[PDB]
Amino acid sequence: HCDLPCGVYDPAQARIEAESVKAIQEKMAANDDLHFQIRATVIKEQRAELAKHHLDVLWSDYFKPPHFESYPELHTLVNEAVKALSAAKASTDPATGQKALDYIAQIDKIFWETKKA
């Protein structure tokens, strides 16, 4: 995932950051303090960006032509996953964080399927 390439990848990197995004959104509903809201927004932006980066890496580095041929919907899936993360950056609604997590889980399943083969 370092582009050497090292041969080591794991969608869990994207998932953990996406989990933080959702967890922060959940916390934003229980504390309306201004400074907490500011910090929560700032940090959510950072974690969502990292999640997007991790997905971009799977798409650009790990997945190869044979994979896109076997999974014709993969390009759209990853593109929708990163767009969902952008939507989560602009929202305090945990549902947006959840949507990103759901797409990531779909990508994770495909990832491990290509690893077994």
- Does 31 bind a copy of itself (CB under 8 A)? Our answer is no
Residue 1 assigned ligand-binding role: yes
> Which of residues 14, 51, 59, 103 is near a copy of itself by CB under 8 A?
59
Buried b / exposed e across 4-42, counting CB within 10 Å, b at 16+?
eeeeebbbebbbebbbbbbebbeebeeeeeeeeeeebee
Window of 2-10, 50-58, 63-71, 98-106 that interacts with Ni ion by CB under 5 A: 2-10
Q: State the DSSP string of 38-91.
A: HHHHHHHHHHHHHHHHHHHHIIIII--HHHHHH-TTHHHHHHHHHHHHHHHHT-
- Does 66 bind a copy of itself (CB under 8 A)? Our answer is no
* Helix (H/G/I), strand (E/B), else coil: 9: coil
Residues that bind Ni ion (CB under 5 A): 1-2, 6
Site residues, a copy of itself (CB under 8 A): 1-8, 10, 12-13, 16, 19-20, 23-24, 27, 34-43, 45-47, 49, 52-53, 56, 59-61, 63, 65, 68, 75-76, 79-80, 82-83, 86, 89-90, 92
Task: Extract the annotated binding site for Ni(2+).
Answer: 1-2, 6
